[model samples]
Target: ANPTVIKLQDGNVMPQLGLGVWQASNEEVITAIQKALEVGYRSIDTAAAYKNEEGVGKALKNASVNREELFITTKLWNDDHKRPREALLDSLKKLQLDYIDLYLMHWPVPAIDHYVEAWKGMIELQKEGLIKSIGVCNFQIHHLQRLIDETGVTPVINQIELHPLMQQRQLHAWNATHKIQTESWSPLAQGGKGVFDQKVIRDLADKYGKTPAQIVIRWHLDSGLVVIPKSVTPSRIAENFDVWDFRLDKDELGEIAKLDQGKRLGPDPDQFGG
Candidate 1:
């Protein structure tokens, strides 16, 4: 089944569930993308930093699905903040696409302070029709505020490292207040380290007849956040997308919310990539 669609503040709709290819090699990603596509995922997230755009491009090219049916997201590397135009051009070439569905500034990198300039460049590209939407990843409230205060444009989404253990509720709420969509990366806590074993998740898994990973994915869905769970494994790719058939109760959601520890598994956005 197709994932639910969310309309961005900019009026573009995207699949709420997508396949993320963070560390997948070119060879591995091709088969993974094919399986994801076969399993009814229309959204695919990749990045220049991921260094597998060519494989992503190749897989999409061979798919029976049409380009318009896909939502492709890629990022502007932190170092490319000053030259987003050239950087985007290179990404477009690598991905073999004339336009990207969503282009994002990978990080704020406050130490360098060029994120605003990068947003400006992306804005220009949007007007040129090279991009359908522009957003950011790993941005704190202050960084997001500056981008809007300076450019008069709000990002359509903020992709961040989030899981039950590191919920980032404050930041997520801020994004919602500004009408920016919140997208989660590492939503399953990267291989479910301390996440899947939770009593609450396990209880829900038994209750719904779904895997713990599926339980976690459904939590993100029920929370009104976009989620991309990365896995090149065919069975897991199919499993991640198999969450549309059930809904979590309000009480169950609260039980999962209690799992939050404010723990962070990735770099701190405030000090990272500088």
Candidate 2:
């Protein structure tokens, strides 16, 4: 099935599930995005930090799909908070897009205390119609609130590290309370080492005849969060999107929720960039 659509606060629509190319090389990402689009993925998430925007653009150019039907997302690097317009234009040139579907600040970088300034720049870009929506990544609640309080603007989404082991329930609820969408990065816990072995995940996989990764992605979908599971392999990309048929029950979701141990696989948002 094609992925469902979500309406952002800015009134733009995004696909609920998308392909994420975080560590993919420019050469590798071209083929990866081709395979993803062939398998029915309409959203592709990359970043200026990933250094694969050109490759992403190349693949999109080669594809048969219309540009208007696709949802493309790119981000501002942590160091570019002071010049968001330049960063965004650079990314747009590489991605070969006239306008970005969603432009996100890659991180808060509280040490620099310039995300508010960055948000101000993005707000202007949105006003100019260069960006369809604006958001942030790896931003804690305080960072989000600061942007809102200082600039009178709210991000349309907050992309963070989330999985069964590192579920940030309080933060997720807060995002919901304020109408910011919560997106999951590294949603499979970086290849699901310890997470895939858990009894609950394995049991659900067995019961549903789906792979462990599929079960986990479904959990993110069932939880009502936009999920982008990264994979460069063609088959795995298709497998990750093959989860549209079945869903986890509420009781099973609760069982998986019990697996949360506050484990984090990436740099802490509170300390990183500081």
Candidate 3:
């Protein structure tokens, strides 16, 4: 089945569930992308920093799916903050797609203090039709505020490292207040441990007759958050997109909310990638 969608502030809707490819190797990443396309996921999130764009491009090119039917999201790495326009063009050539659906700043990297300039470059790229939407990843509230305060524009989404362990309720609320879609990376805690290891998740899994991963994915969906779960395994990749059929009730949702430890599984936005 086609996945559900969240209407972005820019009036564009993105598939609520997508495939994320990070920390993966060459051929593995390539084959995974090809299979993810074969499965139900209509969205694919990658990055120049991920160092797998070429393989991602190959899957996109070789796949039978039409370009218009897929949602592609990638990002500007830290090194290219001053040259987003040229960087984006390189990404385009690498993806082999006419235009990227959503392009983002991979990190705020405030130590360099050039994110605002990169945002300007993205603005130029957007106007030129090279990228359809522009946003950021791993941005704190102050970082996001600066973008809006300086540019007089708000990002359509802020992709962050969010999971049950790191609920990020404060940041998530801030994004919502400003009408920015909050997308989650590593929503399953990058495979077990903090996520599936929970007794709460297991109880819910047994109660719903779903895997713990499915339970966590459904929690994001029920929370109205966009989530991308990455995997190299075909069955797990398919299982990640299989959350549409289930619904989490209020009490169940509250139970999952209790899993929050406010611990981050990825780098802290405040100090990372500087």
Per lDDT, the best of the predicted structures is 1
lDDT of 2 by residue, 171-195 (tens): 9999989999999999999989888
Least accurate 10 contiguous residues by lDDT in model 3: 1-10
lDDT, residue 60, model 1: 93
The pairs that clash in candidate 2 are none
Against the reference, the lDDT scores of all candidates come to 0.95, 0.93, 0.90
**Regions more than 4 Å wrong, model 1:** none
Which has the better TM-score: candidate 1, or candidate 3? 1
Worst 10 residues of 1 by lDDT: 1-10
lDDT of 1 at 223: 97
| lDDT sort, best first | 1, 2, 3
Clashes of each: 0, 0, 0
lDDT by residue for model 3 over 1-274, one digit each (tens)?
3478889999887999999998788798888988888877889999998888988999888899899989999999998999998888898888888899999999989999999999988988898998888899999999999999999889999999999988999999999999999999999987778778788899889988899999999999999999999899988988887887779999988988998898887887888876
lDDT score at residue 161, model 1, on the 0-100 scale: 93
